[PDB]
Amino acid sequence: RVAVQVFDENLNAKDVHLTDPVPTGRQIIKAAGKHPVDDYAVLAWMPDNALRPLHLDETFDLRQHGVERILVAPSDTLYRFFIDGQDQEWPVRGITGVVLKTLAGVDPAAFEVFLVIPGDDDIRVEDHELFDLARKGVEHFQTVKRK
Amino acid sequence: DRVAVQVFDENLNAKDVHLTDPVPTGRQIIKAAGKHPVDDYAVLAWMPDNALRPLHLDETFDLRQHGVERILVAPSDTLYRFFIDGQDQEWPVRGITGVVLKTLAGVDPAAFEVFLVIPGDDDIRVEDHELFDLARKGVEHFQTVKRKAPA
Amino acid sequence: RVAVQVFDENLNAKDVHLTDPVPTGRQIIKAAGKHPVDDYAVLAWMPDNALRPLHLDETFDLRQHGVERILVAPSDTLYRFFIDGQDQEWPVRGITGVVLKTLAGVDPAAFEVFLVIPGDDDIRVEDHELFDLARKGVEHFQTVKRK
Amino acid sequence: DRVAVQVFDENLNAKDVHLTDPVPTGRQIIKAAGKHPVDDYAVLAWMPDNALRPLHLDETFDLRQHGVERILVAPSDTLYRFFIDGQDQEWPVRGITGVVLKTLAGVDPAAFEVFLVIPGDDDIRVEDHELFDLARKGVEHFQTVKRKA
Amino acid sequence: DRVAVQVFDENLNAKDVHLTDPVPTGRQIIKAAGKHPVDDYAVLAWMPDNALRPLHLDETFDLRQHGVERILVAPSDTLYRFFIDGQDQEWPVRGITGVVLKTLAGVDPAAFEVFLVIPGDDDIRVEDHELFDLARKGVEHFQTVKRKA
Amino acid sequence: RVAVQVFDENLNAKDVHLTDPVPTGRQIIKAAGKHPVDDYAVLAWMPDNALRPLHLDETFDLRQHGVERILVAPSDTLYRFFIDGQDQEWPVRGITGVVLKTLAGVDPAAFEVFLVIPGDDDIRVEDHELFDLARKGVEHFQTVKRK
Amino acid sequence: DRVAVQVFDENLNAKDVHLTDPVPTGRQIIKAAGKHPVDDYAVLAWMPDNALRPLHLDETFDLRQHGVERILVAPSDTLYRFFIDGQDQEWPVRGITGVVLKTLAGVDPAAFEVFLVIPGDDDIRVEDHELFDLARKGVEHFQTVKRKAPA
Amino acid sequence: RVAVQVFDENLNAKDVHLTDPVPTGRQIIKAAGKHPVDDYAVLAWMPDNALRPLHLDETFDLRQHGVERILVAPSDTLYRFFIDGQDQEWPVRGITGVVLKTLAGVDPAAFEVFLVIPGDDDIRVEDHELFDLARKGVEHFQTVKRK
Ligand SMILES: [Ca+2]
Ligand SMILES: [Ca+2]
Ligand SMILES: [Ca+2]
Ligand SMILES: [Ca+2]
Ligand SMILES: [Ca+2]
Ligand SMILES: [Ca+2]
Ligand SMILES: [Ca+2]
Ligand SMILES: [Ca+2]
Ligand SMILES: [Ca+2]
Ligand SMILES: [Ca+2]
Ligand SMILES: [Ca+2]
Ligand SMILES: [Ca+2]
């Protein structure tokens, strides 16, 4: 029994046991109890907090890559953005400030996250404000220490 | 070590690029392709089984180990999820043409037709040069059918 | 003593107790009370609902694979098909819509199953319609929620 | 990092194939073999004891652990079940020849004959290059006999 | 047997330099550039991806293997760390101009503006010929904006 | 799994395990448990005790270079100096005599370190005296055996 | 192929020498300089970075390949090891003058002063025409300092 | 790992592994575990037994020159002499007959070495007699077959 944490779009985890330490994308989604499989995105959450998309037929050695967290979410489209310089992809059109501050690896209570706009004023994303990643352009997010 | 890779765009137009490092990052690939700003471009290694694997700007990729000689770079703020002949794929542009689909499927585009398979409803044929909108609600399912008379 | 449910082609189950946690294909067929052994197919029903054929001399560790369900049916030929994208094999020439929707892992009452024909009209398979899998070609089935 | 496996067709013509992954899926094998559409092809790992094990397109298979160096890919909508010298086998094509049978049996095809054994009735001999129809009703039982002169 | 490399100063004025060794040390580069004392000069190979890599006086550097044809030498007792469009950079001189930044960024300086991005606060635009002081506390983050008319 | 000692500006070490033998500068800083990544300098500590700066996106084969020690420290500026003739860079404005004598590869108890001033008096750096490297000029240090 | 090389002595007095072979040996150089016995003379090619590389009588040296046009020949039974501004050097004569040191350092001797750097002790200034004894115990460390007023 | 033999003034070797096949003089001395670096002479021992001095900052391709032996010794002065017609330099004021006969490439047991004085009697250097190369003049040594 291989235990992996499966996260949803809100970064709530569910413990899942795998019989094969090298699952496919299908095996992860099936074990997560999600259907139809073709409607769900699966993204291994790397040790450096990077989200790496996996294909349903792509084999992935969890042990070799040191991956113990997986993200599964219903998605027909992935949105591209940056948080503290990390290239990321988000499977849901919306994302909240606390999730961002979590992706950044900071204490969400102690930091603020802004949509950084070069040359214009930055837009602060509130902890529970759902930010629309469907905006035109690649969204650039950065965390600021909350004194 | 000069590594030659074919860099494809959303239209599958290729350009040869020579790399000094056989294990480049996504950032290095986009830079070598002569594209800026780097943060506005998606890079997807085109695997030998024709699967498109997105790469991050900081993600190292051994081209020799993975047997990858083709790379896709395209301007993209969002990736669209779809299936072609059962293959899990991602497309960096809102549009994709029938010739690209049949190419992703690994068929000779002249001898095949590609359809958007609608379960329980009539299938919609995608013309070779018709720009198909992958931004439609739902995950688009495409399948290639042998075209009796190459038209 | 390992208890396993043994299914027939109609997915009617019978509990069978095994003295060996690593049986052979013959041992399963014998324990299921079917003879002659050479006229019966045995397919381990994997956790992801994939049917993996077993040989009469092939040893199979049920615990390692987490397999607790087995399908036994008389068969001189296996028919190849897909259900919601899963590579499957069926030991009988016929299969019903309710069995397909069961293989698909859906609630058969809440879903409809179609034989997907690319470019032509799709054929809906009734719950108790026995579909002839001996037709030329690989049969492709997909389940749709019944709105 | 190139893993070599021989890929056989229904007539037992082989092609060497190099894999980047020593544990490919069935899909990866068929794609690497250059066969399309993938959904129309069956893949069966040829085990060291001459057993043919069907693989799914999504089923991972450790070639090295199983000691498998030969693979069979063939266009197939149906597998036919038969026995050769007591070995449980499946053939993805409706036809099989005596030389292929004697090959599966691990005997020298020149020194042996293969018969379709019929219990209580007369046995039917399968010629080396006779293509035998496995679509006959029932499970086909084949057995090899030494061609002792 | 003459290997040509361009040597840049802090203002990006270049001088062609011929080397007898395609793998010189940092000392050899500075000496060949005609700079003294050598211990007062920093040398940073300008990589093909516009990355500036500091070299030690005793560090051997294969120019051909790295595809490096441009070199930066400048008088420096301290390197200042900053970012331009996400690239980790070091500048050996306390000052840097907008045109130099846009040059490091690989953009057409006429068609772009460069800003010092301040998260949550107002951004400071760096003029082409404004000499910006990198000695400010913190790591300086610069980002280029298209001067779309 | 590659184990490396990660040093701070005081040369206090922490063992860090890496999943990749060719990490990037970001990957090292992330694994060391330091954030934000953009505020930290990383310097591979070469076998000849030379400190080679690494970029956040610069891949570094630790095995090829035989590097098993890494220095990570928060830094907005690197200071240039010499110790026993070695071109070095220090990420912090201050450096102690014991660290210098350590960089020099000498036994700090058996040696004295001086800031060599040509033509003027040399300044001895105490083991725990924090020397200000932000002074104008390139600092030249040389170690002398304490007779 | 007449190759012209400047031959310097311990005092850095030059004499032009024409060579028939662009790849001479140390023996050939000393002979061409008009010095005998050959076995009593050291020859050190003066590299472009001002480093002095000793040559053996039988050692071939491609002047064109190494870009060397200056050669040092001097009577010597022993070479002395020293440093100037961090450069590893060898001197064939027991004595060396401050002007030669500042010349080896590549500075204008009028605008600079050269010191024997003593770690932890006071530095000893070497005058331009003071003959410095390199036979002192230890490796001598010299460093040039800008002379505020050219004296 | 590039293996080179490092010799001392007595021609005793120590195996040393190099990470770079083109080391500098510093890299050799550092790997040899000698300090301070500025107090040591390094001389590549050429295939024809010629000793070629290297600078601390001089790059030397061991493979191109076919060099696998290196001599490191503490030295502030090199002494010039000839053995069997070979122009040589010795970093230590003293040298023994066995080392000379070794430099000459002869069997030290089967040969005698003399300081050849033209017109005067030659002085024989005993195998373990330490000969003072600080004598005025260039020392001329020649090996004689010991019948
Ligand atoms: Ca702003
Ligand atoms: Ca967006
Ligand atoms: Ca879509
Ligand atoms: Ca249809
Ligand atoms: Ca069928
Ligand atoms: Ca049959
Ligand atoms: Ca700064
Ligand atoms: Ca002093
Ligand atoms: Ca300083
Ligand atoms: Ca001396
Ligand atoms: Ca005599
Ligand atoms: Ca002497």
CA of E46 to the centre of ligand 7 (A): 20
Peptide bond into H108 cis (omega under 30): no
B1, B31, B35, B39, best to mutate vs chain E, most E CBs in 10 Å: B31
Q: Does F77 touch chain B (CB under 8 A)?
A: no
Whole-angstrom Cα distance, residue E73 to residue E90? 13
Picking from A122, A115, A76, A120, the residue whose alpha carbon sits closest to that of residue A96 is: A115
Could you give the C-alpha distances from F120 to F84, G105, G107, G120, G149, in angstroms and in order? 18, 20, 20, 10, 17
Give exposure, C48-67, as e/b (b: 16+ Cβ within 10 Å).
bbbbbbbbbebebebeeeeb
Whole-angstrom Cα distance, residue E113 to residue E102? 8
* The two three-digit tokens of residue G7, written as one number: 């031959």
* The two three-digit tokens of residue A141, written as one number: 């997010």
Whole-angstrom Cα distance, residue A38 to residue B89? 11
Mark whether C and B touch (3+ CB pairs within 8 Å): yes
Whole-angstrom Cα distance, residue H137 to residue C144? 103
Query: Which of F85, F119, F144 comes nearest G86 by C-beta?
Result: F85
Ligand nearest to the CA of G78: 12
Picking from E101, E31, E108, the residue whose alpha carbon sits closest to that of residue E71 is: E31
Could you give the C-alpha distances from A125 to A73, A97, A141, A143, in angstroms and in order? 22, 5, 9, 10
The verdict on a CB contact (< 8 Å) between F35 and A65 is no
Give exposure, F30-53, as e/b (b: 16+ Cβ within 10 Å).
bbbebbbbbebbbbbbbbbbbbbb
Could you give the C-alpha distances from F84 to E54, F49, F106, G119, in angstroms and in order? 20, 11, 10, 11
Contacts of C among chains (3+ CB pairs under 8 A)? A, B, D
* The two three-digit tokens of residue G25, written as one number: 């040996």
3-state secondary structure of C97: helix
Peptide bond into H36 cis (omega under 30): yes
Could you give the C-alpha distances from E57 to C104, E39, H60, in angstroms and in order? 67, 8, 16
Listed in sequence order, the DSSP H helices in F1-146 are 25-31, 62-65, 97-103
Tell me if F61 sits within 8 A of F22, measured CB to CB. yes
Picking from E147, F39, B79, the residue whose alpha carbon sits closest to that of residue A118 is: E147
Mark whether A and F touch (3+ CB pairs within 8 Å): yes
Backbone angles phi, psi at H97, to 5 degrees: -60, -35
The verdict on a CB contact (< 8 Å) between F19 and A65 is yes
Whole-angstrom Cα distance, residue C27 to residue C86? 28
Give exposure, D2-33, as e/b (b: 16+ Cβ within 10 Å).
eeebebbbbeeeeeebebbbebbbbbbbbbbb
Tell me if C15 sits within 8 A of C30, measured CB to CB. no
Q: Does A19 touch chain C (CB under 8 A)?
A: yes
* The two three-digit tokens of residue F131, written as one number: 């020397």
Query: Which of F118, F121, F124 comes nearest G115 by C-beta?
Result: F118
The verdict on a CB contact (< 8 Å) between E80 and F79 is no
Whole-angstrom Cα distance, residue B60 to residue B39? 17
Q: Which DSSP category does B123 fall into?
A: P
Tell me if B124 sits within 8 A of B140, measured CB to CB. no
Tell me if F2 sits within 8 A of F20, measured CB to CB. yes
Q: Does E78 touch chain F (CB under 8 A)?
A: yes
* Shortest CA gap A37–chain C (Å): 8
Whole-angstrom Cα distance, residue C4 to residue C16? 5
Q: Residue G20, exposed/middle/buried by CB under 10 A (0-12, 13-18, 19+)?
A: exposed
* The two three-digit tokens of residue B65, written as one number: 């180990």
* Shortest CA gap G75–chain E (Å): 29
Q: Does H78 touch chain G (CB under 8 A)?
A: yes
Picking from G14, G19, G39, the residue whose alpha carbon sits closest to that of residue G29 is: G19
Tell me if D28 sits within 8 A of D21, measured CB to CB. yes
Backbone angles phi, psi at A98, to 5 degrees: -70, -35
Tell me if F70 sits within 8 A of F5, measured CB to CB. yes
Q: Does F2 touch chain A (CB under 8 A)?
A: no
Query: Which of E86, E115, E123 comes nearest A85 by C-beta?
Result: E86
Whole-angstrom Cα distance, residue F95 to residue F117? 18
Whole-angstrom Cα distance, residue F42 to residue C20? 58
Whole-angstrom Cα distance, residue F14 to residue D39? 52
Picking from E71, E89, E67, E75, the residue whose alpha carbon sits closest to that of residue E26 is: E71
Residue corresponding to tokens 């020498």: G17
The full 3-state SS of chain G, as one line of letters, equals: CCEEEEEECCCCCEEEEEECCCCCEHHHHHHHCCCCCHHHEEEEEECCCCCEEEECCCCECCHHHHCCCEEEEEECCEEEEEEECCEEEEECCCEEEHHHHHHHCCCCCCCEEEEECCCCCCCEEECCCCEEECCCCCCEEEEEEECCCCC
Tell me the DSSP string of chain A.
Answer: -EEEEEE-TT--EEEEEES-SS--HHHHHHHTT-SSGGGEEEEEE-TTS-EEEE-TT----TTTTT--EEEEEE-SEEEEEEETTEEEEESSSEEEHHHHHHHTTS-TTTEEEEE--TTSPPEEEPTT-EEETTSSS-EEEEEEE--
Give the pairing of strands E140-146 and E112-116: antiparallel
Whole-angstrom Cα distance, residue A8 to residue G41? 83
Peptide bond into F36 cis (omega under 30): yes
CA of G116 to the centre of ligand 8 (A): 9
Contacts of B34 (CB under 8 A, 6+ apart): none
Picking from A20, A27, A31, A91, the residue whose alpha carbon sits closest to that of residue A58 is: A27
CA angle at residue D4 from D1 to D7, to 5 degrees? 145
Chain F partners of H19 at a C-beta cutoff of 8 Å? 47, 64-66
Chain E partners of F58 at a C-beta cutoff of 8 Å? 51, 53, 88
Q: Does G104 touch chain E (CB under 8 A)?
A: no
Tell me if C50 sits within 8 A of D59, measured CB to CB. yes
Give exposure, B46-77, as e/b (b: 16+ Cβ within 10 Å).
bbbbbbbbbbbbbbbbebeeebbebbbbbebb
Give exposure, E68-98, as e/b (b: 16+ Cβ within 10 Å).
bebbbbbebbbbbbbbbbbbbbbbbbbebbb
Q: Residue G9, exposed/middle/buried by CB under 10 A (0-12, 13-18, 19+)?
A: middle
CA of G117 to the centre of ligand 12 (A): 28
Q: Residue H121, exposed/middle/buried by CB under 10 A (0-12, 13-18, 19+)?
A: exposed
Could you give the C-alpha distances from D58 to B84, E115, H53, in angstroms and in order? 16, 50, 65
Whole-angstrom Cα distance, residue H144 to residue H84? 10
Ligand nearest to the CA of H139: 12
* The two three-digit tokens of residue C34, written as one number: 């079917």
> Quick one: CA dihedral E120, E122, E126, E131, positive or negative?
negative
Q: Which DSSP category does B141 fall into?
A: E
Q: Does H137 touch chain G (CB under 8 A)?
A: yes
CA of H136 to the centre of ligand 12 (A): 5
Tell me if B132 sits within 8 A of B97, measured CB to CB. yes
> Quick one: CA dihedral C33, C39, C44, C48, positive or negative?
negative
Whole-angstrom Cα distance, residue B14 to residue B29? 14
Whole-angstrom Cα distance, residue G9 to residue G73? 6
The CB-based long-range contact list for D105-111 (8 Å cut-off, 24+ gap) reads D105/D50, D105/D142, D105/D144, D106/D50, D107/D144, D110/D147, D111/D146, D111/D147
Backbone angles phi, psi at D31, to 5 degrees: -60, -45
The verdict on a CB contact (< 8 Å) between E86 and B36 is no
CA atoms within 13 A on the CB side of C7: 19
Q: Which residue in chain H is spatially nearest to F48 when comparing CA positions?
A: H30
Whole-angstrom Cα distance, residue B138 to residue D74? 34
Query: Which of F47, F64, F106 comes nearest H35 by C-beta?
Result: F106
Position D40: which residue type? D
Tell me if H37 sits within 8 A of F85, measured CB to CB. yes
Residue corresponding to tokens 């050669």: G71
Contacts of F43 (CB under 8 A, 6+ apart): F51, F52, F53, F54, F70, F71, F72, F89, F91
Tell me if D84 sits within 8 A of D143, measured CB to CB. yes
Position F139: which residue type? E
Give exposure, B114-142, as e/b (b: 16+ Cβ within 10 Å).
bbbbbbbeebeebebeeebebeeeebbbb
Whole-angstrom Cα distance, residue C85 to residue D116? 37
Residue corresponding to tokens 């040359």: A119
Residue corresponding to tokens 């590869």: F105
Whole-angstrom Cα distance, residue C91 to residue E45? 68
Q: Which DSSP category does C126 fall into?
A: P
Whole-angstrom Cα distance, residue A43 to residue A29? 11
Whole-angstrom Cα distance, residue F142 to residue G119? 7
Query: Which of C85, C120, C144 comes nearest B120 by C-beta?
Result: C144
* Shortest CA gap H93–chain E (Å): 30
Whole-angstrom Cα distance, residue C33 to residue C35? 7
Beta strands in chain D (DSSP E): 3-8, 14-19, 41-46, 52-55, 70-75, 78-84, 87-91, 95-97, 112-116, 124-126, 131-133, 140-146
Picking from E93, B53, G66, the residue whose alpha carbon sits closest to that of residue A52 is: B53
